[PDB]
């Protein structure tokens, strides 16, 4: 079985820059190599076949080159929508085999998060649980720290974070942090606060509310 | 146009089996074979094999019915390792080699003994707002298995929408949120409804979110 | 137009391992289009020997194996047997020129070490009925020789015949030895006006001559 | 077992037309791609034409585009090749060949027919003259004699020769025909027999030249 290797799991670039991704086969496959692009929640999309041939509809900025064992995939001018995982594949022998993929990630200017806090809804409380949601909207870079405080008590192990993929237009990230308590316990406390530190914030930002107000 | 449509997400208990379907349209089914593939976060894209239209060794059985224009893939005694997204795909033209151009949307297979459970949809109401921007959302709580889809105003609202990847809770149920940001000046001029579809439990919910 | 290039000949002694190379281009083998191999024995149709680059059909001994690398393919035979003598073709698909199944030029595979054998030669005079049709043909049958290089000459009395000679090219019989045919056309007047006629067969320095007279 | 049998080949004048056919049995005709492959005398193999299991896809070698037409009858389990504007260079054996299954990367020809000869020539069909070769003993083993039949000036190939209506098998040796400078063919067939039976055993050579519809039975006897 032919092994297809993409050494870089992640590759980073900027809008308008040139970027190149490498793929190696452990067997001389001449030019029997295809390249695929896969965006979040989508099926792979064929970009290049036979190492250098552009498939129908692929934009001109996508090129492939190489022969033998060392193949290269290039984007001449990176665009915001180009965020994706890129896979090489040999179509030289059976079984068909794929590289591990290289995720493309865009550099951009620092962007400080927009922070919102949502109390549990009445409808959720009537059901017995209480989820408090802290939302960090359209920031960069990805690195962000969220701390929950309940009547000035730091929370640990009580919350779960979720982050979106890099936005295909502004290349920012968004993040949700969800603190879950029982109804009885939520009603035992007054002040609910989430504190956010991010490279774009000169000083930590706090959003809070008082149960009842 | 050539189109491959795959069956819906599946929940399979360990040791059971499931048959996956790929309906084809837009060509003579007998002229092209269908390729099957498996995608996981750890093992990546893996080719399984091909359904001959005139008809992973022990795990996969590949078949096809020309009368329904449908390719089939039965997965045998399933384990946690068979939890994945499965694609069917087709070569672009008659004399092409094995490069894949026409792909199905993928079928998610969850291998688990847990029970399927439809979600509850709670609103995340807007209040007093980063200057000129307000935020609202829906909390889709405690469902199983994946996946869930969320749109806003029947799909007519796409700007400012962020649907977060689900987290798995210690209970063994999933939970996610979908938020949209809108200009503050729009808060009291338009209705905001999140549409939630969890096909594995045949749950469809339209939920208004009011400030 | 494109073809797959093979060597026209490949030789090996019994027991050895031989390879037949098959070189294509980026439009066929190099693009991943699979390579297939066929064996043809004299007077028969080609038979599938290897398919899918390296798969042996049911019945092909495991001494035959296939492989490929870059634009080149290779058939290998370990433990070369005398019965492996035959023609071998590789085959693939070429996407240039709107697409076509493309064949290799072919390789004749000879096993060396076959022991020489001297020919049996028979010479017939013109029958009486042929003469009655105003024609005369002498028949020289050469058979059971090895290797195949044979040389025929005709003599009238003791002087070589200018023309009228038709000699076939040797071909192998079911016993793996060669046979050939040489014919000498004469008019009845030459056949009866000469003292004798001779067929001269030379094979590997050795010569036999058979003579017949009216 | 799979079987393929081609027929319809023969002699044709430059510019003429021929219709080859192939009959198949032992497999679902309707599920396989069919093909024509030809091999010129003493030359290599050249793919000619391919038809899909549904006739939806038909392809031709450039060298035959516009002159040849492939087609198939799935109810009759039959494949056809309509050859027009034939030329000398179309002379060859024409094989009908099935395309096996493969998972991308282009398939192989898994079964071939025996073939059928096609001869494109302005020359005329020439029947043979069959003459006897009277028994001779000098070159044969002790107590045996060589006895022959000369098949002269025929065209085109092939000729079949048997002896005593096929009853006589041991000792027969038919030689490959010679191709004369005139384009005609000649071959000899001799059989070695017991020198003792040369008096009471009758020996007949049966020559069949179907290309001209000529059959000859020649008795051979000692001078």
């Amino acid at each position: 079985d032919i092994v297809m290797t993409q050494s870089h799991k992640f590759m980073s670039t900027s809008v308008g820059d040139r970027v190149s991704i490498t793929c190696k086969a452990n067997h001389d496959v001449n030019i029997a190599v295809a390249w695929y692009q896969q965006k979040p929640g989508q099926s792979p999309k064929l970009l290049i076949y036979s190492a250098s041939y552009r498939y129908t509809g692929v934009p001109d900025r996508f090129t492939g080159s190489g022969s033998g064992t060392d193949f290269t995939f290039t984007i001449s001018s990176v665009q915001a929508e180009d965020l994706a995982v890129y896979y090489c594949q040999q179509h030289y022998d059976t079984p068909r085999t794929f590289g591990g993929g290289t995720k493309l990630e865009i550099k951009r200017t620092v962007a400080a998060p927009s922070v919102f806090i949502f109390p549990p809804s009445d409808e959720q409380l009537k059901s017995g649980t209480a989820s408090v949601v802290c939302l960090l909207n359209n920031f960069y870079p990805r690195e962000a720290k969220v701390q929950w405080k309940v009547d000035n008590a730091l929370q640990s192990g009580n919350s779960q974070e979720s982050v979106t993929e890099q936005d295909s237009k502004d290349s920012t990230y968004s993040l949700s942090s969800t603190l879950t308590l029982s109804k009885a316990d939520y009603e035992k406390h007054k002040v609910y606060a989430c504190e956010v530190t991010h490279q774009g914030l000169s000083s930590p930002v706090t959003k809070s509310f008082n149960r009842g107000e | 146009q050539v189109q491959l449509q795959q069956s819906g997400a599946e929940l399979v208990r360990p040791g059971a089996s499931v048959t996956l379907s790929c309906k084809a349209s837009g060509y003579i089914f007998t002229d092209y074979e269908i390729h099957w593939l498996k995608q996981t976060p750890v093992h990546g894209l893996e080719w399984i094999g091909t359904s001959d239209p005139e008809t992973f060794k022990g795990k996969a059985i590949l078949t096809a019915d020309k009368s329904s224009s449908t390719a089939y893939m039965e997965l045998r005694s399933l384990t946690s390792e068979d939890s994945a997204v499965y694609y069917c795909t087709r070569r672009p033209y008659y004399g092409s080699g094995a490069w894949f151009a026409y792909w199905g949307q993928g079928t998610l297979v969850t291998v688990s003994a847990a029970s399927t459970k439809g979600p509850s949809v709670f609103p995340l109401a807007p209040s007093s707002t980063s200057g000129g921007t307000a935020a609202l959302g829906c909390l889709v709580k405690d469902y199983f298995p994946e996946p869930v889809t969320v749109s806003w105003n029947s799909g007519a609202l796409t700007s400012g929408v962020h649907t977060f990847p689900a987290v798995l809770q210690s209970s063994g149920l999933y939970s996610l949120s979908s938020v949209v940001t809108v200009p503050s000046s729009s808060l009291g001029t338009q209705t905001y409804i999140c549409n939630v579809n969890h096909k594995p439990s045949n749950t469809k919910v339209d939920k208004r979110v009011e400030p | 137009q494109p073809v797959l290039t093979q060597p026209p000949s490949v030789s090996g002694a019994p027991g050895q391992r031989v390879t037949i190379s098959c070189t294509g281009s980026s439009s066929n083998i190099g693009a991943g289009y699979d390579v297939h191999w066929y064996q043809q024995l004299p007077g028969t149709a080609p038979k599938l020997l290897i398919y899918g680059n390296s798969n042996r059909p049911s019945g092909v001994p495991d001494r035959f194996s296939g492989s490929k690398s870059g634009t080149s393919a290779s058939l290998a035979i370990t433990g070369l047997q005398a019965e492996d003598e035959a023609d071998y073709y590789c085959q693939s698909y070429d996407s240039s020129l709107s697409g076509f199944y493309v064949f290799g030029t072919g390789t004749k595979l000879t096993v060396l070490g076959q022991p020489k054998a001297a020919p049996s030669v028979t010479l017939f005079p013109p029958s009486s009925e042929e003469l009655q049709a105003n024609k005369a043909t002498l028949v020289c049958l050469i058979s059971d020789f090895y290797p195949g290089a044979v040389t025929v000459a005709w003599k009238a009395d003791s002087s070589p015949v200018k023309a009228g000679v038709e000699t076939t090219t040797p071909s192998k019989q079911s016993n793996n030895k060669y046979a050939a045919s040489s014919y000498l056309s004469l008019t009845p007047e030459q056949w009866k006006s000469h003292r004798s006629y001779s067929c001269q067969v030379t094979h590997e320095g050795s010569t036999v001559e058979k003579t017949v007279a009216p | 077992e799979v079987q393929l049998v081609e027929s319809g080949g023969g002699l044709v004048k430059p510019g003429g037309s021929l219709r080859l056919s192939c009959a198949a049995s032992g497999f679902t005709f309707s599920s396989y791609s069919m093909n024509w492959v030809r091999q010129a005398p003493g030359k290599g193999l050249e793919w000619v034409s391919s038809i899909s299991s549904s006739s939806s896809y038909i392809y031709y070698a450039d060298s035959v585009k516009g002159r040849f037409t492939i087609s198939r009858d799935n109810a009759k389990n039959s494949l056809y090749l309509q050859m027009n504007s034939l030329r000398a260079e179309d002379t060859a054996v024409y094989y009908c060949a099935r395309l096996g299954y493969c998972s991308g990367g282009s398939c192989h020809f898994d079964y071939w027919g025996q073939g059928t000869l096609v001869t494109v020539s302005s020359a005329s069909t020439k029947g043979p003259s069959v003459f006897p070769l009277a028994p001779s003993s000098k070159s044969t083993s002790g107590g045996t004699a060589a006895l022959g039949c000369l098949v002269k000036d025929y065209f085109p190939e092939p000729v079949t020769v048997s002896w005593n209506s096929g009853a006589l098998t041991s000792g027969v040796h038919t030689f490959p025909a010679v191709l004369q400078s005139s384009g005609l063919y000649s071959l000899s067939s001799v059989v070695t027999v017991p020198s003792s039976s040369l008096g009471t055993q009758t020996y007949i050579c049966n020559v069949n030249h179907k290309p001209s519809n000529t059959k000859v039975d020649k008795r051979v006897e000692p001078k």
Side-chain angles (χ1 to χ4, degrees), chain A residues 116-122 124-129:
Chain A
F116 308 84
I117 194 171
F118 297 92
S121 66
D122 283 338
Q124 196 195 356
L125 292 174
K126 153 156 148 54
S127 98
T129 62

mmCIF file with all atom_site columns, all heavy atoms in Angstrom, chain A residues 116-129, unseen atoms left out:
data_model
loop_
_atom_site.group_PDB
_atom_site.id
_atom_site.type_symbol
_atom_site.label_atom_id
_atom_site.label_alt_id
_atom_site.label_comp_id
_atom_site.label_asym_id
_atom_site.label_entity_id
_atom_site.label_seq_id
_atom_site.pdbx_PDB_ins_code
_atom_site.Cartn_x
_atom_site.Cartn_y
_atom_site.Cartn_z
_atom_site.occupancy
_atom_site.B_iso_or_equiv
_atom_site.pdbx_formal_charge
_atom_site.auth_seq_id
_atom_site.auth_comp_id
_atom_site.auth_asym_id
_atom_site.auth_atom_id
_atom_site.pdbx_PDB_model_num
ATOM 1   N N   . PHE A 1 116 ? -20.969 39.003 25.314 1.00 0.00 ? 116 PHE A N   1
ATOM 2   C CA  . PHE A 1 116 ? -22.359 39.019 25.743 1.00 0.00 ? 116 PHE A CA  1
ATOM 3   C C   . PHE A 1 116 ? -22.576 37.908 26.760 1.00 0.00 ? 116 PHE A C   1
ATOM 4   O O   . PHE A 1 116 ? -21.945 36.849 26.686 1.00 0.00 ? 116 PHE A O   1
ATOM 5   C CB  . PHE A 1 116 ? -23.328 38.806 24.572 1.00 0.00 ? 116 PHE A CB  1
ATOM 6   C CG  . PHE A 1 116 ? -23.098 39.723 23.408 1.00 0.00 ? 116 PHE A CG  1
ATOM 7   C CD1 . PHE A 1 116 ? -22.145 39.422 22.452 1.00 0.00 ? 116 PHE A CD1 1
ATOM 8   C CD2 . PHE A 1 116 ? -23.859 40.876 23.256 1.00 0.00 ? 116 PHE A CD2 1
ATOM 9   C CE1 . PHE A 1 116 ? -21.939 40.262 21.369 1.00 0.00 ? 116 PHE A CE1 1
ATOM 10  C CE2 . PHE A 1 116 ? -23.659 41.720 22.176 1.00 0.00 ? 116 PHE A CE2 1
ATOM 11  C CZ  . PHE A 1 116 ? -22.697 41.413 21.231 1.00 0.00 ? 116 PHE A CZ  1
ATOM 12  N N   . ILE A 1 117 ? -23.482 38.145 27.707 1.00 0.00 ? 117 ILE A N   1
ATOM 13  C CA  . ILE A 1 117 ? -23.831 37.143 28.709 1.00 0.00 ? 117 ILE A CA  1
ATOM 14  C C   . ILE A 1 117 ? -25.341 36.959 28.687 1.00 0.00 ? 117 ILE A C   1
ATOM 15  O O   . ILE A 1 117 ? -26.086 37.942 28.645 1.00 0.00 ? 117 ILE A O   1
ATOM 16  C CB  . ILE A 1 117 ? -23.334 37.533 30.116 1.00 0.00 ? 117 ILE A CB  1
ATOM 17  C CG1 . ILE A 1 117 ? -23.412 36.336 31.061 1.00 0.00 ? 117 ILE A CG1 1
ATOM 18  C CG2 . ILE A 1 117 ? -24.137 38.691 30.685 1.00 0.00 ? 117 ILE A CG2 1
ATOM 19  C CD1 . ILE A 1 117 ? -22.727 36.576 32.409 1.00 0.00 ? 117 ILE A CD1 1
ATOM 20  N N   . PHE A 1 118 ? -25.790 35.706 28.687 1.00 0.00 ? 118 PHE A N   1
ATOM 21  C CA  . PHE A 1 118 ? -27.206 35.370 28.642 1.00 0.00 ? 118 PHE A CA  1
ATOM 22  C C   . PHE A 1 118 ? -27.580 34.634 29.918 1.00 0.00 ? 118 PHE A C   1
ATOM 23  O O   . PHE A 1 118 ? -27.009 33.567 30.194 1.00 0.00 ? 118 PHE A O   1
ATOM 24  C CB  . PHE A 1 118 ? -27.530 34.493 27.432 1.00 0.00 ? 118 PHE A CB  1
ATOM 25  C CG  . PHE A 1 118 ? -27.275 35.155 26.107 1.00 0.00 ? 118 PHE A CG  1
ATOM 26  C CD1 . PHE A 1 118 ? -26.053 35.008 25.466 1.00 0.00 ? 118 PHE A CD1 1
ATOM 27  C CD2 . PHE A 1 118 ? -28.263 35.919 25.494 1.00 0.00 ? 118 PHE A CD2 1
ATOM 28  C CE1 . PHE A 1 118 ? -25.818 35.613 24.231 1.00 0.00 ? 118 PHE A CE1 1
ATOM 29  C CE2 . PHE A 1 118 ? -28.032 36.525 24.265 1.00 0.00 ? 118 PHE A CE2 1
ATOM 30  C CZ  . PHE A 1 118 ? -26.810 36.372 23.634 1.00 0.00 ? 118 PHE A CZ  1
ATOM 31  N N   . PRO A 1 119 ? -28.524 35.126 30.711 1.00 0.00 ? 119 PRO A N   1
ATOM 32  C CA  . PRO A 1 119 ? -29.006 34.347 31.854 1.00 0.00 ? 119 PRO A CA  1
ATOM 33  C C   . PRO A 1 119 ? -29.791 33.138 31.386 1.00 0.00 ? 119 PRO A C   1
ATOM 34  O O   . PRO A 1 119 ? -30.214 33.070 30.220 1.00 0.00 ? 119 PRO A O   1
ATOM 35  C CB  . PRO A 1 119 ? -29.910 35.338 32.609 1.00 0.00 ? 119 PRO A CB  1
ATOM 36  C CG  . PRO A 1 119 ? -29.480 36.700 32.121 1.00 0.00 ? 119 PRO A CG  1
ATOM 37  C CD  . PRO A 1 119 ? -29.085 36.486 30.688 1.00 0.00 ? 119 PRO A CD  1
ATOM 38  N N   . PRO A 1 120 ? -29.990 32.149 32.253 1.00 0.00 ? 120 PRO A N   1
ATOM 39  C CA  . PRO A 1 120 ? -30.898 31.055 31.898 1.00 0.00 ? 120 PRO A CA  1
ATOM 40  C C   . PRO A 1 120 ? -32.287 31.603 31.619 1.00 0.00 ? 120 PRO A C   1
ATOM 41  O O   . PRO A 1 120 ? -32.745 32.544 32.269 1.00 0.00 ? 120 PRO A O   1
ATOM 42  C CB  . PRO A 1 120 ? -30.881 30.150 33.136 1.00 0.00 ? 120 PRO A CB  1
ATOM 43  C CG  . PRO A 1 120 ? -30.213 30.966 34.230 1.00 0.00 ? 120 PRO A CG  1
ATOM 44  C CD  . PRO A 1 120 ? -29.309 31.926 33.537 1.00 0.00 ? 120 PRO A CD  1
ATOM 45  N N   . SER A 1 121 ? -32.952 31.018 30.633 1.00 0.00 ? 121 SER A N   1
ATOM 46  C CA  . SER A 1 121 ? -34.311 31.423 30.312 1.00 0.00 ? 121 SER A CA  1
ATOM 47  C C   . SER A 1 121 ? -35.295 30.881 31.346 1.00 0.00 ? 121 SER A C   1
ATOM 48  O O   . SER A 1 121 ? -35.075 29.832 31.961 1.00 0.00 ? 121 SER A O   1
ATOM 49  C CB  . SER A 1 121 ? -34.697 30.924 28.923 1.00 0.00 ? 121 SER A CB  1
ATOM 50  O OG  . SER A 1 121 ? -34.747 29.508 28.920 1.00 0.00 ? 121 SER A OG  1
ATOM 51  N N   . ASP A 1 122 ? -36.394 31.613 31.535 1.00 0.00 ? 122 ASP A N   1
ATOM 52  C CA  . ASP A 1 122 ? -37.474 31.098 32.365 1.00 0.00 ? 122 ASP A CA  1
ATOM 53  C C   . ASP A 1 122 ? -37.874 29.700 31.918 1.00 0.00 ? 122 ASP A C   1
ATOM 54  O O   . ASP A 1 122 ? -38.051 28.796 32.745 1.00 0.00 ? 122 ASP A O   1
ATOM 55  C CB  . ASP A 1 122 ? -38.673 32.046 32.312 1.00 0.00 ? 122 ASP A CB  1
ATOM 56  C CG  . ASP A 1 122 ? -38.480 33.284 33.177 1.00 0.00 ? 122 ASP A CG  1
ATOM 57  O OD1 . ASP A 1 122 ? -37.654 33.244 34.114 1.00 0.00 ? 122 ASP A OD1 1
ATOM 58  O OD2 . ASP A 1 122 ? -39.153 34.305 32.919 1.00 0.00 ? 122 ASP A OD2 1
ATOM 59  N N   . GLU A 1 123 ? -37.992 29.496 30.605 1.00 0.00 ? 123 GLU A N   1
ATOM 60  C CA  . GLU A 1 123 ? -38.420 28.199 30.101 1.00 0.00 ? 123 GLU A CA  1
ATOM 61  C C   . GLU A 1 123 ? -37.454 27.093 30.508 1.00 0.00 ? 123 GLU A C   1
ATOM 62  O O   . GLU A 1 123 ? -37.890 25.970 30.782 1.00 0.00 ? 123 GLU A O   1
ATOM 63  C CB  . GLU A 1 123 ? -38.582 28.250 28.576 1.00 0.00 ? 123 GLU A CB  1
ATOM 64  N N   . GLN A 1 124 ? -36.144 27.377 30.560 1.00 0.00 ? 124 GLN A N   1
ATOM 65  C CA  . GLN A 1 124 ? -35.219 26.342 31.017 1.00 0.00 ? 124 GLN A CA  1
ATOM 66  C C   . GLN A 1 124 ? -35.351 26.117 32.516 1.00 0.00 ? 124 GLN A C   1
ATOM 67  O O   . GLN A 1 124 ? -35.341 24.970 32.975 1.00 0.00 ? 124 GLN A O   1
ATOM 68  C CB  . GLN A 1 124 ? -33.764 26.680 30.672 1.00 0.00 ? 124 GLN A CB  1
ATOM 69  C CG  . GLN A 1 124 ? -32.855 25.443 30.795 1.00 0.00 ? 124 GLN A CG  1
ATOM 70  C CD  . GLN A 1 124 ? -31.356 25.740 30.824 1.00 0.00 ? 124 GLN A CD  1
ATOM 71  O OE1 . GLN A 1 124 ? -30.916 26.882 30.687 1.00 0.00 ? 124 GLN A OE1 1
ATOM 72  N NE2 . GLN A 1 124 ? -30.564 24.689 30.995 1.00 0.00 ? 124 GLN A NE2 1
ATOM 73  N N   . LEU A 1 125 ? -35.470 27.200 33.293 1.00 0.00 ? 125 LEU A N   1
ATOM 74  C CA  . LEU A 1 125 ? -35.601 27.055 34.739 1.00 0.00 ? 125 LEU A CA  1
ATOM 75  C C   . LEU A 1 125 ? -36.785 26.170 35.086 1.00 0.00 ? 125 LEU A C   1
ATOM 76  O O   . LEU A 1 125 ? -36.665 25.247 35.900 1.00 0.00 ? 125 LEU A O   1
ATOM 77  C CB  . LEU A 1 125 ? -35.733 28.424 35.403 1.00 0.00 ? 125 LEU A CB  1
ATOM 78  C CG  . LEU A 1 125 ? -34.450 29.252 35.326 1.00 0.00 ? 125 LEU A CG  1
ATOM 79  C CD1 . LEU A 1 125 ? -34.667 30.658 35.866 1.00 0.00 ? 125 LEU A CD1 1
ATOM 80  C CD2 . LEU A 1 125 ? -33.339 28.538 36.070 1.00 0.00 ? 125 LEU A CD2 1
ATOM 81  N N   . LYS A 1 126 ? -37.934 26.411 34.444 1.00 0.00 ? 126 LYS A N   1
ATOM 82  C CA  . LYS A 1 126 ? -39.115 25.594 34.695 1.00 0.00 ? 126 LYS A CA  1
ATOM 83  C C   . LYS A 1 126 ? -38.853 24.120 34.436 1.00 0.00 ? 126 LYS A C   1
ATOM 84  O O   . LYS A 1 126 ? -39.602 23.272 34.932 1.00 0.00 ? 126 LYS A O   1
ATOM 85  C CB  . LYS A 1 126 ? -40.284 26.093 33.839 1.00 0.00 ? 126 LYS A CB  1
ATOM 86  C CG  . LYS A 1 126 ? -41.326 25.037 33.494 1.00 0.00 ? 126 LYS A CG  1
ATOM 87  C CD  . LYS A 1 126 ? -42.679 25.676 33.191 1.00 0.00 ? 126 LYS A CD  1
ATOM 88  C CE  . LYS A 1 126 ? -43.464 24.887 32.145 1.00 0.00 ? 126 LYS A CE  1
ATOM 89  N NZ  . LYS A 1 126 ? -43.630 23.446 32.505 1.00 0.00 ? 126 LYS A NZ  1
ATOM 90  N N   . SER A 1 127 ? -37.795 23.797 33.694 1.00 0.00 ? 127 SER A N   1
ATOM 91  C CA  . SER A 1 127 ? -37.433 22.418 33.392 1.00 0.00 ? 127 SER A CA  1
ATOM 92  C C   . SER A 1 127 ? -36.445 21.818 34.387 1.00 0.00 ? 127 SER A C   1
ATOM 93  O O   . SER A 1 127 ? -36.174 20.613 34.308 1.00 0.00 ? 127 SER A O   1
ATOM 94  C CB  . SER A 1 127 ? -36.842 22.328 31.978 1.00 0.00 ? 127 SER A CB  1
ATOM 95  O OG  . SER A 1 127 ? -35.422 22.326 32.018 1.00 0.00 ? 127 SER A OG  1
ATOM 96  N N   . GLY A 1 128 ? -35.881 22.617 35.299 1.00 0.00 ? 128 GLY A N   1
ATOM 97  C CA  . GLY A 1 128 ? -35.048 22.113 36.371 1.00 0.00 ? 128 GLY A CA  1
ATOM 98  C C   . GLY A 1 128 ? -33.580 22.489 36.290 1.00 0.00 ? 128 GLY A C   1
ATOM 99  O O   . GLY A 1 128 ? -32.903 22.500 37.329 1.00 0.00 ? 128 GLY A O   1
ATOM 100 N N   . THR A 1 129 ? -33.059 22.782 35.102 1.00 0.00 ? 129 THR A N   1
ATOM 101 C CA  . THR A 1 129 ? -31.651 23.115 34.942 1.00 0.00 ? 129 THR A CA  1
ATOM 102 C C   . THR A 1 129 ? -31.484 24.608 34.691 1.00 0.00 ? 129 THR A C   1
ATOM 103 O O   . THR A 1 129 ? -32.441 25.335 34.417 1.00 0.00 ? 129 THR A O   1
ATOM 104 C CB  . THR A 1 129 ? -31.016 22.303 33.801 1.00 0.00 ? 129 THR A CB  1
ATOM 105 O OG1 . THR A 1 129 ? -31.657 22.613 32.554 1.00 0.00 ? 129 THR A OG1 1
ATOM 106 C CG2 . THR A 1 129 ? -31.152 20.817 34.076 1.00 0.00 ? 129 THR A CG2 1
#
